[PDB]
Amino acid sequence: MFKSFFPKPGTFFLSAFVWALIAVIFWQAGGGDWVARITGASGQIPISAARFWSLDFLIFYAYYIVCVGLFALFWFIYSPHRWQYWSILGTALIIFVTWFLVEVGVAVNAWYAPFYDLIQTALSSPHKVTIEQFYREVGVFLGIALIAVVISVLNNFFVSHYVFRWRTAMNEYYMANWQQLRHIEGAAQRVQEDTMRFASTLENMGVSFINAIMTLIAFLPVLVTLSAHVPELPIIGHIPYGLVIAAIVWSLMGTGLLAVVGIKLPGLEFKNQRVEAAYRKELVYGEDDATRATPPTVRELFSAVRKNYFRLYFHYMYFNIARILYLQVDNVFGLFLLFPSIVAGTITLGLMTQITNVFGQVRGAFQYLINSWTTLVELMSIYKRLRSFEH
Amino acid sequence: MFKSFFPKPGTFFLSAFVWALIAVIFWQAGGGDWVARITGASGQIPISAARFWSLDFLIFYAYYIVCVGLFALFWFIYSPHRWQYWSILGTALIIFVTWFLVEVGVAVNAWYAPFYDLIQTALSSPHKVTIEQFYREVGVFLGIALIAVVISVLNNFFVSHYVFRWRTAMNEYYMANWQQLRHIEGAAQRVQEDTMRFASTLENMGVSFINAIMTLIAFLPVLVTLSAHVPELPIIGHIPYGLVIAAIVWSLMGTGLLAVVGIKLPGLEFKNQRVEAAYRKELVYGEDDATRATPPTVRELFSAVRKNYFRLYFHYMYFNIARILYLQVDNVFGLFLLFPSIVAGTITLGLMTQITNVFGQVRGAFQYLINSWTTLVELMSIYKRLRSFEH
């Protein structure tokens, strides 16, 4: 958000936000799908890797390109710059690619069901299927996995180049005024380290937060539309939306409760680092002078460091117990809710696997948020360091 | 392997190895199991968590205690010490606990079969099953998981205390000779850091290597005895031990190729480090002088660091491609070997799952060793540093 890269620190981000909101609530809720009525959009979506060319996707590609083009051209004409190409279009492209990868994941999860239904048919009645059908299924799976691989690799390449461009832009800006910044202590290590640290950390946090929100908004409606086959839960009885509540409560309770029960550790780590540093400094003074380090004082300092380690070694047990117990029960909790439905003859082998996979992905989407917060505090420290060290 | 903790780096270790060899080739190949003939050993093993009190395990516990007792007491009498109790018995206990946890894993993998046979019967013919059987199966699984959790937590606690005792022992030994070691440059950082680094690194690599070998030696016979139901492979045809050969080849190829295709990276990391250090040093010189920092020289330094990062960014794509491709193919490869047998109706759902899980665990037992190597490199650097800095 500096002045050199990213055309302005003010109106730019606000304008981007407002225009994003206008576009989103013109498409989804306002019903832009009427555009699909002008074209011949059928509305049915295949399962193969031919999904990504049907008009229902191609209209969306056109809409995204049109919106981003208009927005970027406005700024290109209103207030020129030097890194406009990277700062606008690289960010738009990274957002798009994250969405695309989420969609590929959705496609594979949708593929799991026919395969296992076919396996069940094969096992129950040995005269009904041959091997060519299994070969066909493997073929379509490879068809999807290919594009997943290609997009992932190219995305990594482009992200790395973009981050280095941010670093070079603001290093150039700082060195443009080196003479007035000579005297302030720690200018060298600042200019050499904090620039890369800030750029990389902020990019990583932004991408992870966006991806978490996208995964949730893509995968909860599948749980809603699949919760029609599980009317009764083993202990509760009858709830309209038992599956959704159970998944949310289980994943939330796991991640949030483990985060809360292990909140007190970092302070203990501060204490350990401080006492060790005191030991080191006292030894450094003792190195050259023959009256500094005497067995009394070194004994006292080592007693302090030992006593401050044992506290951490004892508090770690709550966290260990909670983590291991949750990890062990998770292997069968997702399967525990589906006994009455299997007996009652509603879900086949192939709607067990989709349900397990969706549980897993919704659980994993509640993990990026605590990564985002953990990265955010780190980013705050460096932000204040780069702000104070500027006049 | 110092002189303070672990009495000697010579005869002690060699004696330990020789006694281990005698004990092992008296038990396995020489058949000490005839003690089971003296006692009323059943010879059969349950499936529940009631396994770990059966005579077959209790005899082994007695034998291990007796062997360790003889070995330890000979050294207690022959050549006394100060930390003998930790140095002998802590290591013996850590080895035993690692083996125990491997056995717990084997028990769970064996439990996976009856459960999925029951689920298949519930899906096919629902008049043969009732829900109480599902509840009983979940009960026995919890019965195993409980002891797994308890042993794991206690083991982590003991390992941490053992490492800290090693550190305090050699710290005390060094500080006994502080007066004569003052002049050697960089003594404070040595005494304050290398002790913890060396102890922790060596212990971690030893534990991981032992655990990998134990997993292989426990999980290969299961594949040998389970490959009797899979006579024909999809392309090869008929081969006496097709499953074992295919599993070994796939896992070894995966891990070894991923390792070899990416051997060049650390050198590039070092080059980047050195160029950045040069840039930092030049800026530090030019800070308080009005001539050292000049646009041409700093421009040259930055050009070097840019041109040298771009090479790593270009090379890393091959590693990305290999990694992602293997990670995506492994999803369905494990099930690709079982198509003719599923079709012909030989294996039931419940031996598909055992086989898949065994594939996963043998693949995960080829990943410890590659980490052991990387830990060994770090160990050796610190070893040479701490051996040069002793007269």
Partner: antibody
Framework: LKLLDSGAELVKPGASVKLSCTAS????????MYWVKQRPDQGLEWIGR????????KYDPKFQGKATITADTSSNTAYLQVSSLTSEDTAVYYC??????????????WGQGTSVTVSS | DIVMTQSPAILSASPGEKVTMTCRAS?????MHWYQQKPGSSPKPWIY???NLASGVPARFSGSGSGTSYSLTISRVEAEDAATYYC?????????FGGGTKLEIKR
Amino acid sequence: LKLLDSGAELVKPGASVKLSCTASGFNIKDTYMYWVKQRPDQGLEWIGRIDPANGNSKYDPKFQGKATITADTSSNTAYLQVSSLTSEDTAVYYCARWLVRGRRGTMDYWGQGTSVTVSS
Amino acid sequence: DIVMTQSPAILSASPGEKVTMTCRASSSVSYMHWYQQKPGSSPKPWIYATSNLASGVPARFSGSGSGTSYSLTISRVEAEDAATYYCQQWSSNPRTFGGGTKLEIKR
């Protein structure tokens, strides 16, 4: 419980015929509904069954391709169709219900039978 | 197919005596049920899973056996037990009946 079958039927060699069995007093989502055939030699022969909740049906291999069993989950009813009738298909056909989920009471209840006379 | 043989194929008794019939399988089942068909009427279970007497039937019927050997026992026959008895196995997806043992009453 009650099961009502159709009436007696007379057919010409070559025609196909459909028989119905309607269930009043319970919910056919909780049971099986199989069909049994008894020739004039009183020995009993098993034809096939169906699971109305999802639709899986199973047949004796000898009768495969000769009979088709279906269920109407909306209004309690089950149907069986016989094709290519010959002179060896004169018998009596009984429907039945077997409790799988909801187990209490008598676990097997039989209908009454519909004679199917094939003649010219 | 699991072929099931029932003996004796024709029987007799008198009011007050005890009667047994045997229905021997051809492999392990664990799933045996016993029926009765009077003249001109549909069948009716007595014994479900070889021991569990179903809803109210006179307490003089009793079944026993396990593995591949099963017996039906009637304690004190009456004039109202002249019928034909079958035995059904259940543990496959062909299901095979028995041969039936016409019972008579002496007088």
